[PDB]
Design a protein around this motif. Sequence first.
Motif, PDB file in Angstrom:
ATOM      1  N   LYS A  83       0.830  -1.199   0.000  1.00 41.76           N
ATOM      2  CA  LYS A  83       0.000   0.000   0.000  1.00 41.76           C
ATOM      3  C   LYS A  83       0.872   1.260   0.000  1.00 41.76           C
ATOM      4  O   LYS A  83       2.022   1.214   0.407  1.00 41.76           O
ATOM      5  N   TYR A 126       0.918   4.909   1.841  1.00 44.35           N
ATOM      6  CA  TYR A 126       0.328   5.727   2.887  1.00 44.35           C
ATOM      7  C   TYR A 126       0.647   7.208   2.681  1.00 44.35           C
ATOM      8  O   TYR A 126       1.758   7.645   2.927  1.00 44.35           O
ATOM      9  N   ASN A 182      -8.358   5.372   0.501  1.00 46.48           N
ATOM     10  CA  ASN A 182      -9.044   4.874   1.682  1.00 46.48           C
ATOM     11  C   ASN A 182      -8.633   5.687   2.914  1.00 46.48           C
ATOM     12  O   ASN A 182      -7.557   5.485   3.457  1.00 46.48           O
ATOM     13  N   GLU A 188      -4.808   5.510   2.900  1.00 47.40           N
ATOM     14  CA  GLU A 188      -4.255   4.278   2.356  1.00 47.40           C
ATOM     15  C   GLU A 188      -4.636   4.220   0.865  1.00 47.40           C
ATOM     16  O   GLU A 188      -5.821   4.344   0.520  1.00 47.40           O
ATOM     17  N   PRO A 235      -4.037   1.971  -2.949  1.00 51.58           N
ATOM     18  CA  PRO A 235      -3.663   0.582  -3.305  1.00 51.58           C
ATOM     19  C   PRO A 235      -2.165   0.381  -3.587  1.00 51.58           C
ATOM     20  O   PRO A 235      -1.671  -0.749  -3.533  1.00 51.58           O
ATOM     21  N   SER A 236      -1.442   1.462  -3.855  1.00 49.20           N
ATOM     22  CA  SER A 236       0.007   1.363  -4.049  1.00 49.20           C
ATOM     23  C   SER A 236       0.629   2.747  -3.913  1.00 49.20           C
ATOM     24  O   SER A 236      -0.083   3.750  -3.898  1.00 49.20           O
ATOM     25  N   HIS A 261      -0.295   4.642  -6.998  1.00 53.01           N
ATOM     26  CA  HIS A 261      -1.648   5.233  -6.950  1.00 53.01           C
ATOM     27  C   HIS A 261      -1.624   6.564  -6.211  1.00 53.01           C
ATOM     28  O   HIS A 261      -2.279   7.535  -6.634  1.00 53.01           O
ATOM     29  N   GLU A 320       5.855   3.972   1.770  1.00 53.46           N
ATOM     30  CA  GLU A 320       5.512   2.663   1.281  1.00 53.46           C
ATOM     31  C   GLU A 320       5.173   1.729   2.452  1.00 53.46           C
ATOM     32  O   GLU A 320       5.899   1.656   3.427  1.00 53.46           O
ATOM     33  N   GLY A 321       4.056   1.035   2.344  1.00 56.96           N
ATOM     34  CA  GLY A 321       3.616   0.068   3.344  1.00 56.96           C
ATOM     35  C   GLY A 321       4.501  -1.165   3.445  1.00 56.96           C
ATOM     36  O   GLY A 321       5.355  -1.397   2.590  1.00 56.96           O
TER      37      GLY A 321
END
Lengths: 96, 96
Positions: A3, A5, A35, A58, A60-61, A64, A93-94
Amino acid sequence: MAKGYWIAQVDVRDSERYKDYVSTAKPAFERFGANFLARGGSVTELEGTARARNVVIEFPSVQHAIDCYNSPEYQAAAKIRQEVADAEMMIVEGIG
Amino acid sequence: MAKGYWIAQVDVRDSERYKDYVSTAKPAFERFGANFLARGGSVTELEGTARARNVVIEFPSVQHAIDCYNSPEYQAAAKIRQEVADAEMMIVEGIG
């Protein structure tokens, strides 16, 4: 993908015009799968001084999140924010 | 119940001792339901200067996050960190 952030820390100077940013940024956030995890919630400062308005989104990447920031829509909305607020913003980066 | 987002922004001077902090912090994190979302993942700076290491931890609630921070266990670990790094840390309440 991990994800992305999007984290914004914001002190609003002009709260009337800040809503103008929030409403015109919204279509970009929605197009890119934002999100919202926290938006201006209660802040507990643990160490250091926090800005008043903190946002954790959040995506999706990371890509994104970056594309959202770079979109014509977000970029126009940001012009508004930059005049009416001080903010640090970043994408982290998650975990993989 | 709104989640608690523990957000830490950290520039590390001594990575070796910082690892000692991470491992000594870990049992506190586990005790209080820490769900790591990001942990020093790569940063894309959008606006303003970011610290190098950024951590986003999701906790079952703000009170969980606070209790973790105030526990003897985390507070002991934190003293290592406060010696070897500069950090801002806060808890933001999740949406609600």
